[PDB]
Chain A
Amino acid sequence: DVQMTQTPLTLSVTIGQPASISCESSQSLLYSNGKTYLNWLLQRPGQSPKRLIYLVSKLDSGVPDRFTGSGSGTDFTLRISRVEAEDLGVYYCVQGTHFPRTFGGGTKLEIKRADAAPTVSIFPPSSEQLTSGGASVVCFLNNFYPKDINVKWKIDGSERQNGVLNSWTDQDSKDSTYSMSSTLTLTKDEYERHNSYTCEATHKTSTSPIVKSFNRNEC
């Protein structure tokens, strides 16, 4: 199998700046008819892969003039003269000269944007859930940047690691921010043996952590 190696693994670039992705094959991708079958795909978040370039440097229909492909033999490069928000996603290198067809590992393009503080909201368990014998406390941290963030849960002031489920969305193409959901799940019995529930967020945009909480007294 021909091995495709893409560099770098990730690329954080600001809008308007250039970006370059490299791809190397262990064997020459030159075919017996003189053509080199090397394509480039782009898989935007939540979408199927889409081919941008084929035969090394030919642009597929609809693909902006900003993209340019070059290379020969075993070394190929994809260049974007000016990055736009819609370019974010995962770029793949793929060869069709040797059997079986193989793809490179992928290069994730992230839009380097200005720092943005998260908007935190906390939610107590719904009455409907409490009836089932369970209790989930939810905390949303929306539209922030960079992606790095630390969320801590405190029940009656004590930190809780067990039973916490965290999930991040991919980078939003409209504002280039990320959002995060943190859910703390407890049994109805444990939820009722405590009073204060706190969601604490540590992010580079604030010197002190951002805190949201509620007590089972004011509902």
Chain B
Amino acid sequence: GVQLQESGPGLVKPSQSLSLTCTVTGYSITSDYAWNWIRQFPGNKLEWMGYITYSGSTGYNPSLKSRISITRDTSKNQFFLQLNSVTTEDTATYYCASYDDYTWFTYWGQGTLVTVSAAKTTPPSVFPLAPGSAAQTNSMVTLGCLVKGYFPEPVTVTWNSGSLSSGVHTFPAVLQSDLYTLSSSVTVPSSPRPSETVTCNVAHPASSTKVDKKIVPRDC
């Protein structure tokens, strides 16, 4: 099938230039269709930025035109986005998509988050969350991991390397003081934990951080 994948910096300093790449596999970008760049702002607002057609002609949204550029590399089957003089208002999720409005052909990328800020990249601190004044007499036991003080978004959280997927709740990060705090919880029957091991795996690409934290019973 056809696949579009965005790649680029997750953090950009204000007034600087943003550069993103969309790698297309499964179809040639010189054959047909328009290859677009669309961004989504926090709050659900979507904005079409521009496109480069299969023939190489470009079209830009009037509101961006003075600082936007879209080019391509027909040998690598990639098209790019360059946005100059970015400000905090350019912070958003960037998507590349291909379609034509009158045919069945439509594909969207996974999207990539771009944060514009002067804050510095900061690795998260991962703290294990285990039951307190209780030994879990119930049938289910809820555990969790607290991912605190990182920047920028996003972080990835899995449990037991992804094998534990049911009963998991990972909450959206909340910003405070230029730092993010996120949490995740997992509920297992009293049978497993503390018998079987439960570990949360968190990854922070921006800081190339990767940490596994085992949840162990408290003594105190």
Tell me, yes or no, whether A156 is within 8 Å of chain B by CB.
no
CA distance A61 to B181 in the complex (A): 40
* Contact among A60, A183, A214 with B132 in the assembled complex (CB-CB below 8 Å): A214
A119, A124, A165: the one within 8 Å of B181 (CB): A165
Does B48 contact A121, Cβ atoms closer than 8 Å?
no
Cβ-based interface call for B55 (8 A): no
Contact between chains at B142 and A61 (CB < 8 Å): no
Partner of A179 from B63, B131, B171 at Cβ < 8 Å: B171
- Distance, CA A37 to CA B103, complexed state (A): 11
A3 in the interface (beta carbon within 8 A):
no
Shortest CB–CB separation between residue A180 and chain B, in angstroms? Answer: 8
A130-163 interface code vs B (CB 8 A; 1 in, 0 out): 0010001010101000000000000000000000
Are B142 and A183 within 8 A (Cβ)? no
Contact in complex: B131, A96 (CB < 8 Å): no
Contacting residues, chain A, for B101 (C-beta < 8 A):
37, 39, 54-55, 96
Residues of B within 8 A of A106 (CB): 44, 46
Contact of A169 among B102, B132, B146, B169 (CB under 8 A): B169
CB-CB contacts of A16-50 with B at 8 A, as 1s and 0s? 00000000000000000001010100000000111
Cβ–Cβ contact B148 & A119, under 8 A: no
Asked whether A126 lies within 8 Å of B128 as measured between CB atoms, the reply is: yes
**B127: Cβ under 8 A from any A Cβ:** yes
Contact yes or no, A181 B185, CB < 8 A:
yes
A173 within 8 A of B: no
Q: Contact check, B132 vs A122: say whether CB atoms are below 8 A apart.
A: yes
A residues in contact (CB < 8 Å) with B:
35, 37, 39, 48-51, 54-55, 60-61, 90, 92, 94, 96, 99-103, 105-106, 119, 121-126, 128-129, 132, 136, 138, 140, 142, 165-169, 179-181, 183, 185, 214-215, 218-219
Which residues of B are at the interface with A, using a C-beta cutoff of 8 A?
44-48, 59, 61-63, 95, 99, 101-102, 104, 106, 108-111, 125, 127-133, 140, 142, 144, 146, 148, 169-174, 176, 181-183, 185, 187, 218, 220
Q: Could you list some 20 contacts between A and B, CB below 8 A?
A: A54-B99, A54-B106, A60-B104, A94-B46, A99-B59, A101-B48, A105-B44, A123-B129, A126-B127, A126-B128, A140-B144, A165-B176, A167-B172, A169-B169, A169-B171, A179-B171, A183-B146, A183-B183, A185-B181, A214-B133
